[PDB]
């Protein structure tokens, strides 16, 4: 059995989210198919050599990633589809049996047979039972879950004859994301995929997580005869053939019209033409060069390893404590060696303010802060807004005096039902008579009075002196300003030390020789995380380099000198002549050795290794690196596209182009030298 390979132009597009958008180009990093890749071309033959002998190309294809299963059927060739995990009756199964008025999905662990045939011939008066024949199964077990979906997830139109359908699958643990559509080609050419753009929308999702490692195709026999030329052959000789693809986690681009339809699709890791469309949110690239990324991408799973801690932070003992204190001796309690869970905080009260100066509350959940302090106090209602960076000293800002560079939140809420009393309201006080402005995070517990110039007041107020710590009077007979408000000012600290307070993120495994996403102890990187031999201090983390780019970070659990080298060469420019002129790009390398590309060593579209090639696309060495994709001529022109080191690029036809002659030249890429005249 010999199989061929066919390419895809622009098909296999799928909506990533489940919402509608209008004039919004969203960029996401998920799993989707790649055009211009090889697809298997299993040619299915329908023949019979006996009553029990059936010949059909039913091979156990291995879906390391999800694959496209086309539906190029005439009437009823493909009706179902099998999915196995081990083919040994050890994992849950799934069947998409979408037949006439019967769309029952069975997910029972069964070991039926090795080859599954399908016919539409009633065995013995099968009009009373279901239309699905009982020759598919051989036993029965405990039924876990079933589906009684009424709508048919199968497009069948026996009038057109051609079936250019697109179907994809998603093997996620959350849902299945079954996307099925159907189109029709206007030309009766061979069984090839037509060119053009197309998108798929989800129809039915399955919340059952099943480990899928083996895939099998299902075909309907529909022979009913043994000799060619009958009412089922010759006139309807429609032995079909289907293709299978594979997924690779890359970055995709999608556009949404005013109605919500996708027009085009751009993959960053296909050609240097499309690399400029991802780094810059645009589809009409201008003439010149741009700074983009190489063909490398991110893998399926990321690494988010955090320090080994299993203790919960005592945030409950902070917010809903029994009794608070006046703001001259605010209760500041540090939190360390625990796991931060910023979810029980919202379960306390309808907070009037949640101003998080510094770290945004979105990323505040997972950053692995060094230490966390919890300052709790009761301030006046209309004076809560003064507890913030800035806010020049008011009558209450001389007690806390938040600094100008704060990296925490300010949670506050009214407590009139726990603090206000008819008589007992003098327990809460505030400092009013101060000498100088306090320092950030500095308390000034004191009972000495302020001398009023004339005579030194020695513990007695008398004529003009006044005792400090005046009462607030938080009685339940005021408005919304003169009410007690319990404020919890969480302050996060980030110093060079092993982190002790992290978010609720699990710890993954270590994958060295792979370009996985770097998320160690809050640091975000996208380089090669492998073993190195750098020199680090014993208790020092988050190492840096001569530049501000993070070069190495020690693992939080098992100390390890692991450096972060970039997955791309970085200095890989892209010469774009414009999406409205041509589609030729000369790749520029900024001071690098011979082309390696560790990720795409032998990709489909490889610009180097084109020494013996005509009409442009040649390799040359420059002072700023290597020039691949153009030619060199001893002529000179203006600054059309600057390459560097006195060399520039220009998109001209050729040096020999006469409009009155019969010799018409191409429009390849040619590079010239710069002249001063």
């Amino acid at each position: 059995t010999r199989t061929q390979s066919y390419t895809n132009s622009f098909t296999r597009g799928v909506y990533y989210p489940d919402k509608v958008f209008r004039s919004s180009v969203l960029h996401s990093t998920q799993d989707l198919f790649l055009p211009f890749f090889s697809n298997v071309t299993w040619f299915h033959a329908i023949h019979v050599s006996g009553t029990n002998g059936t010949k059909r190309f039913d091979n156990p294809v291995l879906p390391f990633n999800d694959g496209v299963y086309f539906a190029s059927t005439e009437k009823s060739n493909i009706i179902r589809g099998w999915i196995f995990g081990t083919t040994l009756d050890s994992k849950t199964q799934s069947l998409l049996i979408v037949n006439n008025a019967t769309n029952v999905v069975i997910k029972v662990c069964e070991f039926q047979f090795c080859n599954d045939p399908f016919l539409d011939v009633y065995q013995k008066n099968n009009k009373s039972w279901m239309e699905s024949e009982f020759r598919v199964y051989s036993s029965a077990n405990n039924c876990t879950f079933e589906y009684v979906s009424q709508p048919f997830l199968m497009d069948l139109e026996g009038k057109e004859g051609n079936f250019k359908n697109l179907r994809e699958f998603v093997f996620k643990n959350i849902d299945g994301y079954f996307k099925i559509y159907s189109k029709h080609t206007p030309i009766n050419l061979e069984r090839d995929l037509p060119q053009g753009f197309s998108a798929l929308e989800p129809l039915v999702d399955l919340p059952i997580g099943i480990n899928i490692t083996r895939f099998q195709t299902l075909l309907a026999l529909h022979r009913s005869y043994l000799t060619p030329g009958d009412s089922s052959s010759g006139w309807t000789a429609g032995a079909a053939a289907y293709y299978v693809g594979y997924l690779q986690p890359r970055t995709f681009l999608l556009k949404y019209n005013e109605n919500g339809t996708i027009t085009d699709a751009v993959d960053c890791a296909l050609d240097p033409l499309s690399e400029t469309k991802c780094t810059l949110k645009s589809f009409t690239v201008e003439k010149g060069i741009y700074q983009t990324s190489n063909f490398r991408v991110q893998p399926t799973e990321s690494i988010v390893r955090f320090p080994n801690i299993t203790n919960l932070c005592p945030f409950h003992e902070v917010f809903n404590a029994t009794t608070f204190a006046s703001v001259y001796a605010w209760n500041r309690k540090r939190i360390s060696n625990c796991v931060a869970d910023y979810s029980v905080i919202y379960n306390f009260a309808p907070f009037f303010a949640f101003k998080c100066y510094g770290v945004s509350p979105t990323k505040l959940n997972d950053l692995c802060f060094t230490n966390v302090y919890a300052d709790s106090f009761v301030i006046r209602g209309n004076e809560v807004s003064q507890i913030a960076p800035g806010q020049t000293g008011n009558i209450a800002d001389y007690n806390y005096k938040l600094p100008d560079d704060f990296t925490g939140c300010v949670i506050a809420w009214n407590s009139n039902k726990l603090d206000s009393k008819p008589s007992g309201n003098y327990n809460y006080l505030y400092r009013l008579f101060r000498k100088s402005k306090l320092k950030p995070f500095e308390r000034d517990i004191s009972t000495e009075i302020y001398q009023a110039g004339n005579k030194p007041c020695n513990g007695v107020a008398g004529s003009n002196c006044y005792s400090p710590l005046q009462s607030y009077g938080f009685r339940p007979t005021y408005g919304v300003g003169h009410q007690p408000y319990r404020v919890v000012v969480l302050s996060f600290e980030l110093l060079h030390a092993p982190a002790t307070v992290c978010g609720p993120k699990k710890s993954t495994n270590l994958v060295k020789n792979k370009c996985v996403n770097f998320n160690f102890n809050g640091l975000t990187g996208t380089g090669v995380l492998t073993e190195s031999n750098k020199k680090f201090l014993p208790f020092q983390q988050f190492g840096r380099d001569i530049a501000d780019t993070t070069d190495a970070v020690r693992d939080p659990q098992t100390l390890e000198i692991l450096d972060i080298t970039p997955c791309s060469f970085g200095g890989v420019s892209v010469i774009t002549p414009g999406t409205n002129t041509s589609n030729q790009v000369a790749v520029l390398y900024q001071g690098v050795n011979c082309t390696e590309v560790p990720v795409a060593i032998h990709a489909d579209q490889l610009t180097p290794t084109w020494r013996v090639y005509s009409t442009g696309s040649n390799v040359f060495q420059t002072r700023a690196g290597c020039l691949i994709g153009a030619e060199y001529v001893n002529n000179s022109y203006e600054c059309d596209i600057p390459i560097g080191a006195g060399i520039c690029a220009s998109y001209q036809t050729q040096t020999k182009s006469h409009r009155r002659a019969r010799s018409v030249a191409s429009q390849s890429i040619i590079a010239y030298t710069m002249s001063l005249g």
């Epitope: 001796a329 500041r332 302090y373 500095e442 308390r443 092993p498 002790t500």
Partner: antibody, heavy 122, light 108 residues
């Protein structure tokens, strides 16, 4: 949830050395000033000093040049080498966790140990 | 070196009374004091640090106050589970000294 388990001798001859071990279980050694504190029987509490993770020692002027506190960052341990032990050094030594924050706070002894009596006799 | 001195060496009272233990010093500590407790023979467990701020798991019966040189500790209700020797720890400079112990007794 940090704990401190003490371990050391119980009877030390005079003029010899004195060293015990407090293993840290509950967190890494990068926050507290894991050190010791002595308490003679029937008297008050006397301090020893504080040792940080970045090798920073500071003792009391009384017993300054008789103690050399060390820390083992590898196996998360720290010991107190007390030399020239005399009869006055009979005390119940405890392991405590002190910390003063950079802003200016002075959090007291949060986590304590259990106590290991060190009798000086022969 | 600051020498912490506690005036009441033994405050004998009954269940329901208020005990006021004082702690004076030579040099003036701004606001950083501490109160400990070790009833049978165990290690002194902290109750109120910074002389006003309670610790996680400390009953509301304990309450500290004072500033400068004079600091006090006010136990509202004398629960049977309060017999211990309370201490005062100066926490301003590097050498942290303690008090002299206050054997709080209960008169049944």
């Amino acid at each position: 949830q940090v704990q401190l388990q003490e371990s050391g001798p119980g009877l030390v001859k005079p003029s010899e050395t004195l060293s015990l071990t407090c293993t840290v279980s509950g967190g890494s050694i990068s926050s507290y000033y894991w050190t010791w504190i002595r308490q003679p029987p029937g008297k008050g509490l006397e301090w020893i000093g504080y040792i940080y993770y970045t090798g920073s020692t500071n003792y009391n002027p009384s017993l300054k040049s008789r103690v050399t506190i060390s820390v083992d960052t590898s196996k998360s341990q720290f010991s107190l080498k007390l030399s020239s032990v005399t009869a006055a050094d009979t005390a119940v030594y405890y392991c405590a966790t002190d910390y003063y924050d950079s802003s200016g706070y002075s959090y007291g002894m949060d986590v304590w140990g259990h106590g290991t009596t060190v009798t000086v006799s022969s | 070196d600051i020498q912490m001195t506690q005036s009441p060496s033994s405050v004998s009272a009954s269940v329901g009374d208020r005990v006021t233990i004082t702690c004076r010093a030579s040099q003036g500590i701004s606001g950083w004091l501490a109160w400990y407790q070790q009833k049978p023979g165990k290690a002194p467990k902290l109750l109120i640090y910074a002389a006003s701020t309670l610790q996680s798991g400390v009953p509301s019966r304990f309450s500290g106050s004072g500033s400068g040189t004079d600091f006090t500790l006010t136990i509202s209700s004398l629960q049977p589970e309060d017999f211990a020797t309370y201490y005062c720890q100066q926490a301003n400079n590097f050498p942290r000294t303690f008090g002299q112990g206050t054997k709080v007794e209960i008169k049944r």
